[PDB]
Amino acid sequence: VKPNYALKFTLAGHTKAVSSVKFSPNGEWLASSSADKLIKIWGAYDGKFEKTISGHKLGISDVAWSSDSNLLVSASDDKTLKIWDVSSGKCLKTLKGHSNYVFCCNFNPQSNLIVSGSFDESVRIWDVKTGKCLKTLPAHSDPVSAVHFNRDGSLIVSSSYDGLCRIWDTASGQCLKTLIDDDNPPVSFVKFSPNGKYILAATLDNTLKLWDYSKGKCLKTYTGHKNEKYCIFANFSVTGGKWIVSGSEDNLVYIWNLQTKEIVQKLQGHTDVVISTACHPTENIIASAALENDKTIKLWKSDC
Ligand SMILES: Cc1cccc(C(=O)Nc2cc(-c3ccc4[nH]ccc4c3)ccc2N2CCN(C)CC2)c1
Structure with missing residues (x-):
C-alpha cells in the first residue's frame, strides 16, 4: 500500500527557477539545471553540494x-x-x-x-x-x-x-x-x-x-493534479511499489498507484510550481524542483 515520502533535504543554491533534476544512473548524484545558466551537482544520499558547472550563455x-x-x-x-x-x-x-x-x-x-x-x-x-x-x-x-x-x-x-x-x-x-x-x-x-x-x-x-x-x-x-501551463516532468517509480510521480502547478508532488490510478501521496513543502521530479534508480528517493518563487530542490525518502 501507500508510500511514506518524508522530506530529507532542501537544496538551496540556484538563484533563479530550477528547470530539471536528474539522478546519475549510478545513484551517486543529483544534477540540477536552472534559468540561472548553471548546473549543480549534489550528493543523492546526503544532499551535499558538490560542484557548479557553468558555460551556457542563457538559461538551461x-x-x-x-x-x-x-x-x-x-x-x-x-x-x-x-x-x-x-x-x-x-x-x-x-x-x-x-x-x-x-x-x-x-x-x-x-x-x-x-x-x-x-x-x-x-x-x-x-x-x-x-x-x-x-x-x-x-x-x-x-x-x-x-x-x-x-x-x-x-x-x-x-x-x-x-x-x-x-x-x-x-x-x-x-x-x-x-x-x-x-x-x-x-x-x-x-x-x-x-x-x-x-x-x-x-x-x-x-x-x-x-x-x-x-x-x-x-x-x-x-x-x-494541476497541469495547464508548464512542461512538468513525470516519472515511473519502480524501486518499491509501482508508482507514477509528477510535479504540479499547485506546488505539490503527486504520487499515484500505477495500476489503480489512485493518488497515494501528495508532498507538501515547495513554494512554487514543481516543474521537475526525479526517481532514484535503486532507492525509494524522489528529487523535486520548483520555479522562481522557490528555486530549491527537495529530496524525499520512503520505505516503499
Ligand atoms: C531555463 C528554465 C527554467 C525553468 C523552467 C524552464 C521551462 O519551463 N522549460 C521549458 C519551456 C518550454 C516552452 C517555453 C516557451 C514556450 N512557448 C510556447 C511553447 C513553449 C514551451 C518547453 C519545455 C521546457 N522544459 C521544462 C523542463 N524540462 C525538464 C525540460 C522541458 C526553463
Whole structure:
C-alpha cells in the first residue's frame, strides 16, 4: 500500500527557477539545471553540494546523464547543447544546429548518441564522440517539450505543443507511430517506461496518460493534479511499489498507484510550481524542483 515520502533535504543554491533534476544512473548524484545558466551537482544520499558547472550563455531547460555517470548533456535557451565532463566540470562539446531554444535532451543507453528537442519544432540526433549532428528530424509543428530513448535506444519518443506524440526509428529517423487523443491538447511531457513497453505522456489539460504506443491504446490516466501551463516532468517509480510521480502547478508532488490510478501521496513543502521530479534508480528517493518563487530542490525518502 501507500508510500511514506518524508522530506530529507532542501537544496538551496540556484538563484533563479530550477528547470530539471536528474539522478546519475549510478545513484551517486543529483544534477540540477536552472534559468540561472548553471548546473549543480549534489550528493543523492546526503544532499551535499558538490560542484557548479557553468558555460551556457542563457538559461538551461534540461540536463541528462550518460549511462556510466561520467558525462552530462544540457539543453539551453542559447540554442546549444553542451556535453560536460562531470569530473572536471569542463565543457567538452558544444552542439550547435538548433535555430531556437533547446528544451530537452537525453543520452541513449549506449551513450554514443544524444537526442534533443527544441522550440524550433525539430528533434536532432547527435554523435557524442564528435558532437556532430547526425540527423535533423522534421519532428513536429510546434515546440518540442520532451525527447527520450527506449531501453535499447532503438526508438525515440517526442512530444510537442502540436498535440502529438511521435515514435521514431533511431537508426533511420523514420516516424513509426503518431499518437492522437481527445481534442489534441499540447503534449507537455513524454517518456518510455523502464522496460520500454509503454509511454507516459502529460497534456496541458491536467492529465497524464499511459499508452501501449504500438497498439495505440491508453491503458491508464493519472489526474487530480494541476497541469495547464508548464512542461512538468513525470516519472515511473519502480524501486518499491509501482508508482507514477509528477510535479504540479499547485506546488505539490503527486504520487499515484500505477495500476489503480489512485493518488497515494501528495508532498507538501515547495513554494512554487514543481516543474521537475526525479526517481532514484535503486532507492525509494524522489528529487523535486520548483520555479522562481522557490528555486530549491527537495529530496524525499520512503520505505516503499
Ligand atoms: C531555463 C528554465 C527554467 C525553468 C523552467 C524552464 C521551462 O519551463 N522549460 C521549458 C519551456 C518550454 C516552452 C517555453 C516557451 C514556450 N512557448 C510556447 C511553447 C513553449 C514551451 C518547453 C519545455 C521546457 N522544459 C521544462 C523542463 N524540462 C525538464 C525540460 C522541458 C526553463
